[PDB]
């Protein structure tokens, strides 16, 4: 049926006035409120699952029970709304929560049972976040908040929480997992959380079903597909999962039927050796499972990550791009000849052989056999025609092959952003794929928007006549500088937009999302950068400063510099100062003044080190003796326990996803502490801090060479060069300890780190300050400032060329993507604000680096 607001409204407006509970809709809900029922702030709520046609029938079936008691409740706006809400794509844990019912605690226990028996036989998804009453009915229940209350986490972000009897917040958040609280019971059946042993040995119990053992392998949504072992064979198997009524089409085709389409296509491809075999298909209760064969250990995504790029003609044996193209199109030709379209050939759906490393196709979820056609596409890799569910064509497959080869040749996907008309411009891909891989023009033709050109390129491929096309640089700065100017202009307007969206409250919509104030994500960093610009941007900065000052008032917070209050105070004070606004200075005066004996954290991101640096920035701003006093307290409390943290990682193994950062990095490791103690020694010249400075710098140099060799490996990853986590942060710290302590050793270490970063640049995923190109370029032009080499200037220019070549919306309107890749945001560390910071200093190298160098003249 997929009904609209009107049908649901009618069926409601009936009985609703029968008990006189006036109705209204907000966001996505249509809610009715009993006047005799006072809705509490949290408790046990009832979720009814359903789907469109079952939604209309569900409304009708449920009214009898719900109006029999005093309670409040909300209903979904429409079946299109319930379709998005039942799609895995956006929120995986809020699928099936079609109707929510809030009654009084005693009333819950019976009401749930009555609703069950009266909805017995109604069908809908399973709500993973709730317990269920009976397996014949679509009735579930949870403990959670009824009003959207938020408390702040150690990250600085705002989280939905429920409150315990001692007033302590608890993320009542729906984590696709139900947890009952210790204080209240469980209205239908009393219960408790943890077993008799307390802080004693624990052994989690996980096991397979009929005759398959499992091992993870996918995040969320339609189905957690699993790697497995076949006990009656002990062969390795792969198990695809489908959850009933998830991803239900406008024709009533749900994920299970996608799985059946996949089984059917696999049967139609039964005689191909590079396609999975279907072994078994079984359902359990309400979950369908398709058991196919294991076809290699690594996808192309993972393989290009850990085994390097696919390069022109020769290069290492496995890594020949032309070999890859030929094999892929041979296989694709086989599939097409069998009357099947892949529709979704992407680096994650090609598995290379464990021995020969030859491509094999998997995931035929949306593949085409007969002409009903399944909707579905993969951002950036699927052609736009597929975004607009147009008739599948062979040339669609050719396009996605071109994109898969693009990734194999560069290690990142073709830039695609939600809502950007430029998404599929081939010149845009040209700028990133800078002639590399040998064949380039051929793969650019595979991505050409004219389908005939894709056919011609695939012809080139089958013939063996590949096209090797190159890219050109930028006119002796004049046009490069014109491009930078326009980049900054449009980014500024985009920032006005993001700032308005922040202060108007839009993104607060997300349950469990965002930090509106701090430096890392919120207004503080945004406005700090906005200050360095024209009078409109400075007006927006003053606005953001007052906004943050008020928002911070009378709510709980954290003391961090990147997560918390110290950065907020630095921003507000700095804005007051440069604007000449004494009331902003008054507002900042009481802000970042923590206990410090409570803070156990010692890193730049959230504790002591970053707090100390921020307090020194404030002192240099305000000549406030309390601020220097706090910075000195930071150094003093940081020298107490150096030894233990070095030697506390023995059971965790190497891979160093956490270890490289949490031990050495600037954000979380001792590079930032080195940076702070250097700052403090400059400010004061204390004799004790100097010793620790030498100790930490020496240990940094001690451990650096392995990291440098790691970054220069094929196996190397962006993490290695990042400012937050890897080499860029360490280099930025050492560039300054050298200078200030007159150490040649330190500056040389910085130079080597800088160069490793230079080589990792193009492979970097994000463009942002914490995780991407801007942090690198910042180290580069830092070194420029310290050691007028001007070769570092050229390096930074390369970084900027990359950043710009990875923007959307063409040059006149760049818009730079988030850590989310597909959209932009205005945050500083993870978004466009920091990118602007870098692009700004590129023309003002004398200006200090933000949050690392102190305020200065000719730099505002």
């Amino acid at each position: 049926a997929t009904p609209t607001e009107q049908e649901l409204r009618a069926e409601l407006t009936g009985p609703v006035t029968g008990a006189g509970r006036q109705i209204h809709a907000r966001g996505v809900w249509l809610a009715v409120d009993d006047p005799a029922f006072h809705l509490p702030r949290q408790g046990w709520k009832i979720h009814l699952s359903a789907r469109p046609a079952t939604l209309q029938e569900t409304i009708r079936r449920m009214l009898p029970a719900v109006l029999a008691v005093p309670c409040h409740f909300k209903v979904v706006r429409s079946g299109r709304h319930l379709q998005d809400l039942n799609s895995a794509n956006n929120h995986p844990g809020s699928i099936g929560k079609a109707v929510t019912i809030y009654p009084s605690p005693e009333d819950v226990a019976p009401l749930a049972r009555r609703l069950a028996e009266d909805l017995a036989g109604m069908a809908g998804p399973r709500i993973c976040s709730d317990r269920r009453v009976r397996p014949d009915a679509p009735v579930y229940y949870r403990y959670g908040p009824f009003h959207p209350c938020y408390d702040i986490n150690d990250d600085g972000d705002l989280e939905l929480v429920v409150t315990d009897p001692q007033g302590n917040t608890h993320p009542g958040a729906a984590d696709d997992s139900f947890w009952q609280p210790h204080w209240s019971p469980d209205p239908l059946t009393g219960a408790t959380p943890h077993p008799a042993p307390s802080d004693g040995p624990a052994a989690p119990v996980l096991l397979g079903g009929r005759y398959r053992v499992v091992r993870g392998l996918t995040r969320n949504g339609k189905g957690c597909v699993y790697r497995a072992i076949d006990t009656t064979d002990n062969r390795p198997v792969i198990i695809k999962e489908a959850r009933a009524h998830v991803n239900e089409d406008t024709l009533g085709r749900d994920s299970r039927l996608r799985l059946r389409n996949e089984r059917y296509v696999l049967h139609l491809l039964r005689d191909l050796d590079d396609v999975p075999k279907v072994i078994d298909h079984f359902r359990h209760e309400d979950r369908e499972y398709l058991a196919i064969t294991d076809l290699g250990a690594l996808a192309l995504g993972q393989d290009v990550a850990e085994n390097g790029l696919y390069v022109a003609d020769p290069a290492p044996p496995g890594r020949s791009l032309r070999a890859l193209a030929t094999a892929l199109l041979e296989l694709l030709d086989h599939v097409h000849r069998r009357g099947v379209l892949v529709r979704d050939l992407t680096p994650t759906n090609v598995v290379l052989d464990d021995a020969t490393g030859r491509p094999r196709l998997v995931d035929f979820e949306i593949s085409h056999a007969e002409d009903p056609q399944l909707y579905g596409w993969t951002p950036g890799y699927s052609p736009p025609e597929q975004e607009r569910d147009e008739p599948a064509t062979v040339e669609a497959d050719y396009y996605s092959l071109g994109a898969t080869l693009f990734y194999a040749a560069t290690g990142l996907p073709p830039t695609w952003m939600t809502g950007d008309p430029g998404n599929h411009d081939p010149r845009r891909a040209a700028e990133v794929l800078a002639g590399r891989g040998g064949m380039s023009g051929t793969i650019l033709g595979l991505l050409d928007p004219d389908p005939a050109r894709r056919r011609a390129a695939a012809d080139d491929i089958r013939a063996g006549r590949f096209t090797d096309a190159p890219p050109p640089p930028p006119p002796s700065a004049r046009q490069r500088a014109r491009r930078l100017a326009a980049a900054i202009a449009h980014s500024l307007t985009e920032l006005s937009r993001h700032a308005a969206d922040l202060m108007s409250g839009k993104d607060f919509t997300g349950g469990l999302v965002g930090s509106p104030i701090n430096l890392y994500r919120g207004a503080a960093g945004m406005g700090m950068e906005l200050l360095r610009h024209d009078e409109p941007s400075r007006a927006l900065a003053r606005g953001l400063a007052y906004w943050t000052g008020g928002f911070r008032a009378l709510r709980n917070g954290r003391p961090g510099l990147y997560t918390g209050d110290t950065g907020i105070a630095v921003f507000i004070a700095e804005a007051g100062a440069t604007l000449g606004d004494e009331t902003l200075l008054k507002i900042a005066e009481p802000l970042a003044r923590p206990v410090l004996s409570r803070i156990t954290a010692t890193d730049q991101h959230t504790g002591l080190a970053g707090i100390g640096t921020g307090q020194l920035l404030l002192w240099r701003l305000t000549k406030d003796a309390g601020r220097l006093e706090l910075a000195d307290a930071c150094a003093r409390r940081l020298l107490a326990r150096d030894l233990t943290a070095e030697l506390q990682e023995n059971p965790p193994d190497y891979a160093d996803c956490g270890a490289v950062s949490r031990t050495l990095g600037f954000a979380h490791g001792l590079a930032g502490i080195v940076h702070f103690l250097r700052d403090h020694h400059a400010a004061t010249g204390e004799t004790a801090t100097e010793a620790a400075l030498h100790k930490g710098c020496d240990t940094l140099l001690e451990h650096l060479p392995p990291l440098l060799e790691a970054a220069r490996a094929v196996s190397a990853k962006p993490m290695h060069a990042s400012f937050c986590q890897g080499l860029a942060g360490i280099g930025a710290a050492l560039a300054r300890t050298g200078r200030d302590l007159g150490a040649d050793d330190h500056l040389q270490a910085a130079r080597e780190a800088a160069a490793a970063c230079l080589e990792l640049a193009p492979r970097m995923y994000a463009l942002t300050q914490c995780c991407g190109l801007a942090g690198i370029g910042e180290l580069f032009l830092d070194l420029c400032q310290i050691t007028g080499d001007r070769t570092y200037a050229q390096w930074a220019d390369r970084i900027a060329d990359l950043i710009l070549a990875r923007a959307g919306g063409s040059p006149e309107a760049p818009v730079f993507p988030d850590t989310s890749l597909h959209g932009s945001s205005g945050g500083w560390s993870i978004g466009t604000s920091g990118v602007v910071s870098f692009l700004r200093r590129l023309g003002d190298p004398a200006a200090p680096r933000l949050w690392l160098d102190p305020p200065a003249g000719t730099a505002r």
């Binding site: 096991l207 993870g216 359990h284 209760e285 979950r287 369908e288």
Partner: peptide, 20 residues
């Protein structure tokens, strides 16, 4: 519709596993 799921069995499914 000869592509059917096949007999329902008793399921032990409890929680998430691994990290890939």
């Amino acid at each position: 519709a000869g592509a059917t799921n096949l007999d329902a069995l008793a399921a032990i499914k409890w929680e998430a596993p691994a990290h890939q």
